[PDB]
Amino acid sequence: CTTVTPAYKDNGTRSGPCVEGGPDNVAQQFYDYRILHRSNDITALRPYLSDKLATLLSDASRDNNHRELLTNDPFSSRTTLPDSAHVASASTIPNRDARNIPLRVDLKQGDQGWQDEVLMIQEGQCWVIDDVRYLGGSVHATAGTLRQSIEN
Amino acid sequence: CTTVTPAYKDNGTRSGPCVEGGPDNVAQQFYDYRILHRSNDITALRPYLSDKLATLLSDASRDNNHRELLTNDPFSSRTTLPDSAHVASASTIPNRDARNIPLRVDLKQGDQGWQDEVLMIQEGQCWVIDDVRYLGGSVHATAGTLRQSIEN
Amino acid sequence: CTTVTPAYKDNGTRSGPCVEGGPDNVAQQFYDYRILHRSNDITALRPYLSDKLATLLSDASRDNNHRELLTNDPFSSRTTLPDSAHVASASTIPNRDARNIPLRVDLKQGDQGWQDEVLMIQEGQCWVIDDVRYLGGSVHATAGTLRQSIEN
Amino acid sequence: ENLMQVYQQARLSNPELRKSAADRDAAFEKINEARSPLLPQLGLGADYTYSNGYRDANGINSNATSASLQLTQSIFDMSKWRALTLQEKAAGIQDVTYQTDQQTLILNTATAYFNVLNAIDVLSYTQAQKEAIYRQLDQTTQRFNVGLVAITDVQNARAQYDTVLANEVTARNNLDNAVEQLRQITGNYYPELAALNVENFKTDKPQPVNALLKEAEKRNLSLLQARLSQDLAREQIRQAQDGHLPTLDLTASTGISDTSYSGSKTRGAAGTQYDDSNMGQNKVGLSFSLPIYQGGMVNSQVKQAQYNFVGASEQLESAHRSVVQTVRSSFNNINASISSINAYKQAVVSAQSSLDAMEAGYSVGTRTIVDVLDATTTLYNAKQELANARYNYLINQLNIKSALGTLNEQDLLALNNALSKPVSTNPENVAP
Amino acid sequence: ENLMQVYQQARLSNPELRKSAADRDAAFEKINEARSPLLPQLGLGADYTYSNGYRDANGINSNATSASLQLTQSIFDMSKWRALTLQEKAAGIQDVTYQTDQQTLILNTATAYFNVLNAIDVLSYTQAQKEAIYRQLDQTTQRFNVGLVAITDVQNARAQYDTVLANEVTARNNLDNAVEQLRQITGNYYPELAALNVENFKTDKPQPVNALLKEAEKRNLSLLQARLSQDLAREQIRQAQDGHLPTLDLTASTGISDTSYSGSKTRGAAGTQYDDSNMGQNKVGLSFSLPIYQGGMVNSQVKQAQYNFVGASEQLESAHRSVVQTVRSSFNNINASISSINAYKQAVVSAQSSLDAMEAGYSVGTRTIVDVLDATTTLYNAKQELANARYNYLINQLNIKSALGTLNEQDLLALNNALSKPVSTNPENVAP
Amino acid sequence: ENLMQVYQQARLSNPELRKSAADRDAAFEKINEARSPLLPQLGLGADYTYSNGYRDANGINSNATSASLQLTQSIFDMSKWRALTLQEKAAGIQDVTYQTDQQTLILNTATAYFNVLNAIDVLSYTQAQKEAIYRQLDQTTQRFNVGLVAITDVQNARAQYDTVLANEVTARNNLDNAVEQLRQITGNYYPELAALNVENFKTDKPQPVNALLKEAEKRNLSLLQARLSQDLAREQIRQAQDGHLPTLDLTASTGISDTSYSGSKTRGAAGTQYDDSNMGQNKVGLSFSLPIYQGGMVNSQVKQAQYNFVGASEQLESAHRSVVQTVRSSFNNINASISSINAYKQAVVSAQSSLDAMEAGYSVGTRTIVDVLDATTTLYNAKQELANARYNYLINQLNIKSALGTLNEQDLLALNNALSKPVSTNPENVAP
């Protein structure tokens, strides 16, 4: 039968709590939380953000400059919460030598669609959300991705 | 069944009349006219030069510098006419995204052959013979191709 | 059926004697000659060196600088002599356009092995030992290959 | 000829984009070849065979001539649909590559045009320098003739004159190479080109880098190609996993056979077992196949497809990072070009003031002709540097648009508003 | 953030090494697919067919259904084992390529770090030059205002100031580009990096070139890859000559068939020979095949394999020569770097002495402020050159280590002892 | 060792041309490989099978052993001949490639030889500069010792001396690297090489550029390779169109079969239908096939072949344009080199005159030793520049000959007349 030895041996240093796993599964769970719970607050979203998107959002909120971006929506190109979500399908991931997996998430409003883009990274032994590249027309505010929006 | 969409939109700008069609067919008709008429005049070959060889040859005849080049033959590597010609075979041309088609013609004089080379261009909705690169030993005169020969 | 014409035409200028043939064959014959005797002299190894190694090692002996190296074993990584030798199999060599053939001969001492490497050069119509790259840990002396060890 | 006319001529006859168009057409047409196996198939086959028996079947010979017409057609096989989807995605990525080739052709022709203009300016400056150095040599020779300097000064002046002659020859060759490069990229030799207008040309501030990134992350062609390649990798995973599904098909046939028997054994009391047969069968039926365990096979292929998908994701991330870096570099280049333009304009002003000072001094009578000639040489050098900087700024303004992924002929038209006055490009006309 | 932390982060998020790991894992996983044909293969098939007779057997119809389970297994076929060994060798060469990718990633991240430091130093020097040039321009303007010089000097000074402003802008953009390149190679924005320490830094002579060659000949990655390719070529020769060998397989089957006849003639005087049949057949057998003369075929394939082996041997020889040349070049480059380090140290000492003399003259009263400002600018230039030389020496040490093939994080750990003082990389902070 | 012996040695021991020879041999053998299927194919096969009955055929067992010798030969199949023609064309293009590698090998060895000579000259000039700078530093030190200058002058002189030492080390390593590159390209260490004979070197004007184009049109290798590729594309179109044609083959077989029966039902009243049977068959048959509509298939493949032909035509046109580019640029390079040669000769003359004047002044008593030493340094620099220009002229002549597609050893024969005086390459012998 034989097996394949992983090339890497650490792929770790995780700080916050992690959800079960599954890239498409984790994206579905996060977006189901977004649709069901209409809060969008960053305090209760720590397990999904990887290790420093939460810190970046907290620092941006404390800076008192990007209030308009934070209030409407930081995690989507549209200023309103979606009506339905369907992320790209990945047929699991072999071993642990896989990071920076981009997924094109299709968010559908009332007869609307923009096909946003997000990233997912390992950061330990879980699957965590990152970037969100606002891949759609009529961008909410600032420009680029979320990270480039709040970067300095 | 589907049908491909041509890459280009116009591919036009044609001034003079054009022959029916067929690059190898046009070359064969040109050589048949060459053997049939022993005058090698340029006034009767108007619909066989696209837009620049006609005026270039007219200028070369008018300035009285390449008279010896023109009188013998401008379209072969030998001063005298060939006895027969047989161009290379091209199995039609799909759509219209095709110009600069080089063809090697085997011209057979009395137990002789030179295998000259010529170009075919679209220049609108037709096929026009061009350049003639004088491929073969014991070249006629000057050097290079006809366009390089009569250029200033 | 047809044949294949060689790219080169001379591949010659041989001075000393040569063995019958066969790259692996000449390597095996050289190692059997080395093990059958206990001299490792360079005067009697002339057929196995074409024109470079023989004169180079003669000069190395004459200059009285590499005496400690030359005495023990120029041609082997171990200061003593190997017990058995077995070069990698080679299924003949087509035509005469093949030189610089590296072969990783495997040497077996008393429960030890080093698996050095030699080079095949044609230089006429025979096969000749060359280089000997000392492919093993804890080499005898100097460094690199024999040529890089004796060249000034 | 202005930039617009040159690009219009180049778009037709440019033997680099035609290869891309032909490859795109071939990829598009391959869809039909991929779909053909799904369509019904029919075939014909005739075979005449003579058999000669021996041993127990001694004295037995047979002659059988058969002709069969067979029509086959699959029903349920997802592999064909998977291949069709793969081919469609391949056509898409090929079209994206063709668009990239169009953009790079636009950039190349603009660069060649500006290179030709720069070569013209350099040749003019070199000619002015040659005249000034020749006058210096004449001055030194006259001084030696009456006797004021040693022979070494004369030799040094002659060396400088020979050096400037070699420089002039090199500049002329550079101009010729640039012109012939324009001919190669356009297929026609251009004897005269439109120059630049000083007043019409205006330096404009670029848009904020954030908006650049916002438009580039969705309009850049490399990112789209990488995303489509990732989609192709996903479809490859699906088609590799498709190995777990069974297949179903239907067949029909019409076969006509004529068999005859002869030989010593046949020539006897066989009666009914040895007769000439004229048979015809219309065979119709189905065929269903469900493979089971074959070793690794499907599982290993699926694992390899997963690894390929992971690699595709890595490629997409790398492409995004490279795109961001390229956009930032282009924006910084535009700003640096603006600053250099201002600096060279100030340098030109200073050189002009110095030349006017030298001319006034010569008119009064405190200067010689060679001094004003040197001032003219310096002014020409400054003008050439300023023109080259302007061309570099325009090329950067095209490069930012190319990086953003929206370059087209409208940008060339916008640039063409500054190219107004014409100028010949013949080396003899510019400098005999 | 020292070099160690930067490299540790780079080993995690770098979308170039993970792709190589994916390729290596796919190559290793293909071994199972290669070994799959040696394993038993079993399948199932269901068929239903209706046949209609004609001509002689007019009005005769048959309906048959069959369900079969078929298992096959090879016994002696050395080709599959050869393919498995070939796959193993391919996996080995893929792993070697992965190791090479690791080494080049280490080299690239070190180079980017030192480039960022060099950009910081250049920006500092350019800021000092800008201050000096501004003071010079102010002096010239004052001189003209009271009236001591012509307007040409003022225009020239303004041109110099504009030039130095453009240079400052260019240096700032270069620093920004270096920081962005570091971010691209590591995936994280870095606002502060460890600088160099002059007391801890030292220069050591390398080992003799002979020992370098000895280590490289047995430890270099490219040579190992070439040798593995030669082994693969030999295995290809053997697997191509394998075609002469015969083959043998075992087969088992279980078939259930239900057949019926009807139509017209069946309901006649036949009685017994036209009846429904329920067949059950457990067929088991063996099949052996020995191919014979097939034209050239095997002979031509063998000859092609031998030619490929010769080409692989030539590749190995060329790789060995290139490795030797590279080792020699690196060993010479390190000595050149040492000499440059000494020269720049002496130059900076001389510049410091000149600045001290100018400062003493200014304090006494024999010098102005522009002189000491120019001395400071020259000293800053010398310091920047010395720092660049030190970074070049470190990069050369890493390069010779890489050429030896023994590059890993231990060399970075050794280098990290010389980096003590952290400094920010924000363009606004260093240059207000 | 002149250029002739160097090239003769590099012809044999050169591990990159042997790869091209092996590739050519493999392509040639592929002709026989492709011709193999056209030849008759024969093979032997054994088959042993055991069957057990069940259900209606209860208690029935059979054992059949068969040995069959098969021999098939195609009668009309144009595809094999078309593949043979394709293989011939591939062999032709491979031969053209091999010629190209021969030409580039000649160019590379000439370039390496001239680079080594230039390195020798540079090292000599640097040694002279070192002597001059050391004498200047000693002069400054003595002046400070008696007391005429400040300490800063001594510091500056020491900095200059250290910079000169670094430059000398760099030049020595450059010469060593050049020698190593020559060894790599020839597989031999050359301790002494033939230098240039100035008296026998006479520059010559080239033939008109028109004649260069005329010869390069029918002589260049790249153009011929592109033409052969277009012909191969046409043959591929013919092969694709070949699919519409029918096929015909002849088969023969000699078979020996032995069948035995056993079981409960066999020991019954079957009598004649249940017995051991020993069959011997000599079958001869003709098989003819003619496919009909298969969806797209052949039509789509023919369209793809036409698209590939269009792409090949575009490639040929682009290759012709590139050839015109290369010929014109190479022609201009020689004239530029001639002008540079004249300028550098005049510069050398002027430098020699200046050195003679300085020597006369020093002999009379109006000059010091450092002045004549500096003059010698300048003269050596000019000599090195002139020698480099001469080598560049020779390389440019070889470049024109190569780009015209006629390079061979006769050009080296022509060049070898100018190499007369040998000179060592070891740095210690060149400059201790």
Author numbering:
A (entry chain P1), B (entry chain P2), C (entry chain P3): 19 to 170
D (entry chain C1), E (entry chain C3), F (entry chain C2): 23 to 454
What do the authors say?
Tripartite efflux pumps are essential for Gram-negative bacteria to expel a wide range of toxic compounds, including antibiotics, across their dual-membrane cell envelope. Among these systems, the AcrAB–TolC complex of *Escherichia coli* is one of the most thoroughly studied. It comprises the inner membrane RND (Resistance–Nodulation– Division) transporter AcrB, the periplasmic membrane fusion protein AcrA, and the outer membrane channel TolC. Structural analysis reveals that YbjP, a previously uncharacterized lipoprotein, binds TolC in a 3:3 stoichiometry, bridging its protomers at the equatorial domain.
An improved 3.39 Å resolution structure of the endogenous AcrAB–TolC complex from *E. coli* was determined, revealing well-resolved density across the entire assembly ([Fig figs3], [Table tbls1]). YbjP remains bound to TolC, suggesting that this lipoprotein is stably retained during pump assembly and functions as a molecular clamp that anchors TolC to the outer membrane during AcrA and AcrB engagement ([Fig fig2]). TolC, tethered to YbjP, caps the outer-membrane end and docks onto a hexameric ring of AcrA adaptors in the periplasm, which in turn surrounds the AcrBZ trimer embedded in the inner membrane ([Fig fig2], 2D). Cryo-EM density reveals six AcrA molecules beneath each TolC trimer ([Fig fig2]), yielding a 3:6:3 stoichiometry for TolC:AcrA:AcrB. The trimeric TolC, which contains six HTH motifs due to internal repeats (TolC repeat 1/2), engages the AcrA hexamer via quasi-equivalent binding: adjacent AcrA and AcrA* protomers interact differentially with the intra- and inter-protomer grooves of TolC, respectively ([Fig fig2]). Strikingly, the membrane-proximal (MP) subdomains of AcrA exhibit asymmetric binding: AcrA-MP interacts with the DC and PC1 subdomains of AcrB, whereas AcrA*-MP contacts PN1 and DN via an extended loop, respectively ([Fig fig2]). AcrZ adopts a helical structure that is embedded within a hydrophobic groove formed by the transmembrane helices of AcrB at the predicted interaction site, forming an AcrB₃AcrZ₃ complex. Our high-resolution cryo-EM structure of the endogenous TolC-YbjP-AcrABZ complex captures the AcrB trimer in three distinct conformational states (L, T, O), providing key mechanistic insights ([Fig fig4]). While the transmembrane domain remains largely conserved between the L and T states ([Fig fig4], upper panel)— maintaining salt bridges between Lys940 (TM10) and Asp407/Asp408 (TM4), the T→O transition entails a coordinated rotation of TM2, TM4, TM5, and TM6, disrupting these interactions ([Fig fig4], lower panel). Substrate entry occurs between PC1 and PC2 in the L state ([Fig fig4], left panel), followed by an 8 Å shift of PC2 toward PC1 during the L→T transition ([Fig fig4], lower panel and [Fig figs6]), facilitating drug transfer from the access pocket to the high-affinity deep binding pocket ([Fig fig4], middle panel).
